[PDB]
From a paper:
One example of siderophore piracy is the uptake of ferrioxamine B, a hydroxamate siderophore produced by many Streptomyces species, by the specific OM transporter FoxA. FoxA belongs to the family of TBDTs (transducers) and is involved in ferrioxamine B transport as well as modulation of transcriptional cascades in the bacterial cell. Here, we determined several crystal structures of FoxA from P. aeruginosa, in the apo state as well as in complex with the siderophore ferrioxamine B and TonB. Our results indicate that the transporter can exist in several different conformations, and that both substrate- and TonB-binding is required to form a translocation-competent state of the FoxA transporter in a two-step TonB-binding mechanism necessary for transport function.
In order understand the mechanism of complex formation between FoxA and TonB we determined the crystal structure of the ternary complex consisting of FoxA bound to ferrioxamine B and the C-terminal TonB domain (residues 251-340, referred to hereafter as TonBCt). Two complexes were present in the asymmetric unit, with crystal contacts generated through the exposed soluble regions of both proteins. We could resolve almost an entire FoxA molecule including the signalling domain (residues 53-820, with 11 amino acids missing from the N-terminus after the signal peptide) as well as the full TonBCt. Similar to the FhuA and BtuB-TonB complexes the primary interaction site between FoxA and TonBCt occurs through β-augmentation with parallel strands forming between residues 332-337 of TonB and residues 142-146 of FoxA. In addition to the observed β-augmentation, the unstructured polypeptide segment upstream of the TonB box (residues 135-141) forms complementary contacts with the surface of TonB molecule mediated by backbone H-bond interactions as well as side-chains Leu137, Met139 and Val142 located in a small cavity on the surface of TonB. The secondary point of contact involves the side chains of residues in the periplasmic loops and barrel interior of FoxA with several residues in the loops of TonB facing the barrel. These contacts are mediated by electrostatic forces between TonBR271 and FoxAD352, and between TonBR266 and FoxAD355 as well as a side-chain (FoxAE316) to the backbone carbonyl (TonBS300) via a hydrogen bond. However, when ligand-loaded, FoxA association with TonBCt leads to the closure of the extracellular loops, shielding the bound siderophore inside the barrel. The inward movement of loop 8, which is seen in the ternary complex with TonBCt, places Lys657 into close proximity of the bound ferrioxamine B with its ε-amino group protruding towards the hydroxamate groups coordinating Fe3+ on the opposite side of His374.
Author numbering:
A (entry chain D), D (entry chain E): 251 to 340
B (entry chain A): 53 to 149, 155 to 820
C (entry chain B): 53 to 130, 135 to 149, 155 to 820
The structure:
């Protein structure tokens, strides 16, 4: 019948000491979008620079909310993958 | 229905879908929105359109419609069961973090405020400025700044003589590095020099700045801010070749050390040489400067710094009589390449060695601590045969004398600052207390004499025989402790400024040759008050009343030590910056009085206090961004300075080496027109008024205008990316001129034309 | 706590949020996803940070939260919601290369999948090589020989695969035959200045195109209207008193952009390399596109053109150019005709229309129509061999003509595109009709002989032979059918035609009318294969049927010319490179060919001539700057059935070997940005001068060069300048001969300088 | 307690013989996202070149689908505006 439909998915906030000393990088993160609409079982696959951005990516994802997957007649979980790039403008 | 072969490489799916739509000759409507964070890794096979499109968008939730011949649209299919879902990536940007101008100073207030809101005249010289102006010493870098007279010993590059608002006495110890005083010893030869290669900025605090930076003069100070480490790998190799034997390679690598980027290094190196304008002289240096910063938690960072420098050769430091340079002596001139000394019995070998850290710890939402520490160790060696007026028997020969030295210096300094940022309803605070402390120990083995006389034009060298006096050995100690307190209050459109300090100093001098010693203690309370009014407009007048206290470790002709120098200054000010606009204008009006300036004539090993000197005048500075490629620097400096108590019969007179009038303009514009992309032409002229030559004001040194020029070109555009080149020339018109005179017997030549072709290599 | 006063412009909210962020001294953490479509406002003094942010995203559903250290982030919020805007783009659709032609197949199809040797010459080429005629634009294209009458620009002569007879009636303009009567002097010229493409179909094409010859056809492509304002003015000054001024306006008329015009116009001249000679032209081409419903579109077109002067079109003996006459050479200037009696005034009026209609997703009809009205005036004195009595004077004769022509032609195509499960069909069916009336009044006579070195002009006296006046009509109607079947990596082409034709000539001054009819089935079977390689080999068996309107010296008219070609071929485009290679290997056999000899007023028919050879063709865009072009032709042709006495011999003006390279570098960076340097060499092998294989016209290599500079870079946008030299090395050479008394010189150095203004 | 949340917002197809001639344009449009969650009452405010793209845009919108707006806990209709820009690549 359907898939994941995002409802709240506000983005994460650049770390304070990252803008200062313009740093930049990325997080790749594997996760689950529970039948219950919420994010779960977050696994980080890439982190450049290591474990720097993770904690905001996690805290942002907390708040996220979705219409869950429908698979003909029972609502189902969904495994997903997403990439965050952090950047500095000018 | 039927398939053709494709080969499309990989990239932001947009591209790859475009190349595809092209090679299949369908059209396909899509939007960035939908092709955003999708990566593509593209086709290489034989395929059937639909099948190729499908294949292309197999790792995404997209699908391509068809709708009859050609056509095709990106709808979002449901739901490709497969396994894992590949959500669109996302870019999260941080928002809000040109050249010769800088609108903020961290040094001026010991905390980062804009200059429009800082109530004291501060000038800034950028790295870019230094490199465009081809300034080869600190002294030189201020050639285009107002307030500041650069020609104090002319072409000498052994030391950085920096004359602020006409107070040209006592001018060597005006230099602070990363916010701590140098820690040289102005009383000896052991006075340190910082190479501009290692600097990011130079902020100039004119007028009394003692409150925050202890043991400073009423003229103000010059603050070196060194390069620090970067958290992105950056690499650089510099090479330069120029006239007068000039030779220089240096490198600059900075980068992060670990993968969590909690640590970074910066290694800067440099080797340079020059056989100066003057006969038989060399200037040689090597230095390394390692910087390393380590974050201790989320609250704390610690920086380790080192700066090891060797000057095996000292350049030139000498002068010749005004009779023969500003006059004509028995009908010729002394050249600008005249030697003076004797090779093989003339050297200045200096070794500077600096170790230190900077601790910065955020205590909470309001409070913070910073701790700055530097140890210095130094070894100067000197022999210098020199000239001092004309011979009493042979007529065209100069009398000459000798000064030899051996000096081990050792000193350390520290500054602890505790900072509170709170509010008082409408009052915005930034309250700061500190306590700071310096120990300095100089062991000096001086030695001195009379040399042979020397013909001032056609000299014959080789008579390095010397008749000596007794050696003079001393051990010199200075200790100083300060407690200070500075609140910056900011209500509505007002910016107040309020400072309070208590210095305690102590100086001793054992003449190890006599045995006898001079132990002396001094205390003084210094402060400032500054009110500034800022208009929405961009404009800001202000008034400042500020005080200065500077212990002196010097001695009379009899040995009776010199008292500290003191200063009071009323300044009236007007800064203006239009909101947005990249220009900044300041007019500043000032009256400064010093008590006990410590003078000194070359020939002498003593100083003299001067009852009082006063300087009043005006400073107009203007950096403008005239367009997208044209930028400008311009300044005017009116300085009226006078001995107002003096017991030498020069009361009322004006001090020498202080020019009344000086102005300078400098521009540089850089193209992106197809013909000339990356090319830049820049230049400027520099004017200096008359100077006196004489405390007794009998001769006058003519004024002088000098021209400077540069061409620069990014060879990156011409294909060799990262590489860039550069040709400069300082005193392009190659003037032959006397820059200043210390006395009637010591007048100094200005540097001749200095051509410098330079190459770079980035990352 | 307290506010600052800001001064901020407007623009894609991203930037405005940035300026604000910088100027406020905060940090907004936000994504292009969320600031995206928004595009706006400004900031107008006197705000806290927050309230500024609020007032910036006031008209959007954004809002920015957080604090602690001027760390903000964007989020969401709650009259009328302003959704983000969208940018929807059409993805889908080169330099000297075209991979695509509509002409070869009457339907759009890439060349990689088309089973017939085809070249395309682009605008860019024409203008880079300074080709001033259609004939000249093919100087770099293989299997085509240019220099046939040498320097003469009065007619476009085009020699396909060594077939140099019948060579003027070969040009089609938007897929309709020109409609000149090649049996008179009233043959039409098209100016390059009006073209987009030249497509050259080597080998028989009679199935789609009606009176096609068996060597092939050249197909010109008119340059239709654009749907946004385009305006270009050009000017050009060169040697040989060359002077040219043109303009090319186009655009849409309405607000719904369903109507558009184009107006191309030029005047130009040249004094040639010949003494007392003038070329001179004025032309105007309005075009008007008008969409009727949403599936029927109409294009009305005109081409008025008036050449009040016709350059030189004459020739002199091989005895004096290839050989020394006494001890002298005839100059490569040299005029052979009285300037008082030398007149060539062609006027072409062409109106027509292009009607496209869509019917289903399957069916579609097309109707192309064109009406021709022309008028040619000739006076011309000419040199035929040496005086029997005065030994350094050429004898001379006269040919004069008033001739008025009118003709029309039309083509109705019905096109069904379907599937048969396995395959994909694209099936074509048509009916085409043409008719042409030429009324001519011609006179000949003899004239005074002329010194071939040191001539004295005057003696425009002519002793007129009695007048030959005629009225020629021709009518032709054909029906055609063509399926293009496509299964997997295979493409097949099937094609059938049935021509019926009728031709007369009442000899108004004698009485004699001849009057004949012919009929003929023709067709095309052709299969290709496309390897994942990018490699596409093919065979083709093609036929041609060309009815002719000429007579014998024996009185009786010439039968239609017939043609059978087998061709084996190999095309190669490495998977989307910017390169293409073709290698073709062919065997044509034309029966009944039709020569002239320029001294007679009559044709000779032949009986079969056979041709075979190889063409290698290359275009390669070796970088973002450098483009390259080259060819080698090998031709082996022979009179295999004739009674001239030359059976077994080789035709004249047909080189065995031909080769051409051309290159154009364009600097796009550095000091030298906007600069373009280009050049080429052309090589023509040895040719024969006569059909007896007696005497050879020696081979020749020509060099061409090109410097060019976009003055955009200096500052004046839409403006460039270019300097061209063709035959850079000013070679003095005989290009070819038609016979031993008629040899032609090549064009001496042609330098030209051009100025351009665009939009 | 909520807003519009789009669930299928697939874009309009570039009309042919518009992209053939390489014509760009724009439509601005004022519309309603009903309780129903579908689009209704499409009013086309700017249309450059006049009447060109409109048909494609109306057709696309009529396939769009949303979570309707909720206001004080009752499903409620809601008025909206959007701009479309039609462009040609490269």
């Amino acid at each position: 019948d359907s898939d994941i439909k995002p409802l709240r998915m506000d983005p994460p906030v650049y770390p304070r000491m990252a803008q200062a000393r313009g740093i930049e990088g990325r997080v790749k993160v594997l996760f689950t979008i529970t039948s219950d609409g919420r994010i779960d079982d977050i696994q980080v696959l890439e982190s450049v620079p290591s474990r720097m951005f993770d904690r905001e990516v996690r805290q942002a994802m907390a708040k996220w909310r979705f219409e869950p997957r429908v698979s003909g007649g029972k609502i189902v979980a969904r495994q997903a993958t997403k990439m965050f790039f952090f950047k500095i403008e000018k | 229905e039927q398939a053709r072969p494709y080969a499309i490489p990989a990239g932001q799916l947009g591209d790859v879908l475009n190349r595809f739509a092209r090679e299949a000759g369908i059209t396909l409507s899509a939007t960035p929105a939908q092709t955003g964070g999708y990566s593509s890794q593209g086709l290489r096979g034989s395929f059937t359109v639909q099948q190729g499109l499908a294949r292309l968008l197999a790792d995404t939730p997209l699908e391509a419609e068809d709708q009859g011949d050609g056509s095709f649209v990106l709808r979002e299919a449901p739901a490709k069961d497969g396994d894992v879902l590949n959500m669109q990536a996302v870019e999260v940007f941080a928002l809000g973090n040109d050249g010769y101008l800088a609108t903020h100073s961290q040094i001026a207030t010991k905390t980062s405020k804009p200059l429009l809101e800082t109530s004291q005249t501060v000038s800034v010289i950028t790295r870019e400025q230094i490199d465009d102006t081809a300034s080869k010493t600190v002294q030189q870098a201020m050639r285009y700044t107002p307030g500041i007279f650069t020609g104090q010993v002319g072409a000498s590059n052994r030391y950085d003589y920096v004359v602020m608002r006409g107070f040209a006495d006592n001018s060597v110890d005006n230099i602070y590095l990363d916010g701590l005083k140098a820690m040289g010893d102005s009383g000896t030869f052991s006075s340190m020099q910082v190479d501009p290669y290692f600097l990011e900025r130079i902020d100039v605090l004119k007028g009394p700045s003692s409150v925050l930076y202890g043991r400073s003069l009423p003229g103000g100070l010059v603050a070196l801010t060194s390069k620090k480490p970067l958290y992105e790998d950056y690499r650089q190799i510099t090479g330069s070749i120029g006239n007068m034997g000039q030779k220089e390679m240096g490198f600059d690598f900075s980068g992060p050390l670990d993968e969590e980027k909690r640590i970074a290094y910066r290694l800067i190196g440099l080797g340079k040489g020059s056989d100066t304008q003057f006969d038989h002289v060399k200037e040689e240096r090597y230095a390394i400067a390692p910087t390393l910063a380590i974050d201790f938690s989320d609250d704390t960072t610690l920086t380790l710094q080192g700066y090891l420098q060797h000057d095996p050769n000292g350049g030139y430091h000498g002068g010749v009589p005004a009779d023969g340079t500003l006059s004509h002596h028995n009908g010729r001139h002394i050249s600008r390449e005249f030697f003076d000394g004797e090779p093989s019995k003339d050297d200045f070998d200096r070794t500077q060695r600096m170790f230190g850290y900077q601790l910065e710890h955020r205590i909470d939402d309001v409070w913070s601590a910073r701790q700055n520490f530097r140890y210095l160790d130094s070894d100067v060696d000197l022999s210098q045969v020199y000239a001092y007026g004309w011979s009493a028997s042979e007529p065209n020969k100069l009398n000459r004398y000798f000064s030899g030295a051996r000096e081990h210096l050792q000193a350390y300094i520290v500054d602890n600052m505790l900072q509170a940022e709170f509010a008082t309803g409408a009052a915005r605070h930034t309250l700061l207390t500190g306590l700071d402390y310096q120990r300095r120990r100089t062991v000096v083995d001086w030695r001195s004499g009379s040399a042979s006389a020397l013909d001032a034009f056609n000299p014959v060298y080789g008579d390095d025989a010397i008749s000596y006096f007794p050696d003079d050995n001393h051990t010199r100690r200075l200790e100083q402790t300060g407690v200070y307190l500075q609140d910056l209050i900011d209500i509505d459109q007002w910016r107040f400024s309020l400072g309070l300090r208590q210095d305690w100093v102590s100086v001793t001098d054992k003449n190890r040759s006599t045995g006898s010693k001079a132990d002396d203690d001094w205390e003084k309370f210094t402060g400032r008050i500054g009110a500034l009014y800022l208009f929405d407009n961009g404009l800001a007048p202000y008034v400042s009343y500020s005080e200065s206290f500077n212990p002196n470790a010097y001695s009379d002709a009899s040995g009776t030590p010199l008292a500290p120098t003191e200063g009071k200054q009323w300044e009236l000010g007007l800064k203006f910056q239009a909101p947005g606009s990249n220009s900044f204008y300041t007019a500043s009006l000032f009256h400064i009085t010093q008590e006990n300036v410590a003078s000194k004539e070359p020939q002498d090993n003593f100083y003299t206090s001067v009852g009082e000197v006063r300087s009043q005048g005006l400073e107009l500075e203007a950096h403008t961004q005239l367009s997208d490629n044209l930028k400008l620097l311009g300044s005017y400096t009116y300085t009226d300075i006078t001995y107002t108590k003096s017991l030498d019969g020069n009361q009322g007179h004006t001090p020498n080496q202080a020019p009344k009038h000086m102005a300078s303009l400098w521009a540089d514009y850089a193209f992106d027109a197809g013909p000339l992309s990356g090319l830049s032409i820049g230049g400027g002229a520099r004017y200096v008024g008359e100077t006196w030559a004489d405390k007794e004001n009998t001769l006058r040194v003519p004024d002088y205008t000098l021209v400077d020029a540069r061409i620069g070109y990014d060879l990156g555009k011409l294909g060799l990316k990262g590489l860039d080149v550069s040709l400069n020339a300082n005193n392009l018109l190659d003037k032959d001129y006397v820059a200043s005179c210390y006395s009637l017997d010591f007048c100094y030549f200005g540097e001749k034309r200095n051509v410098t072709a330079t190459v770079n290599y980035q990352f």
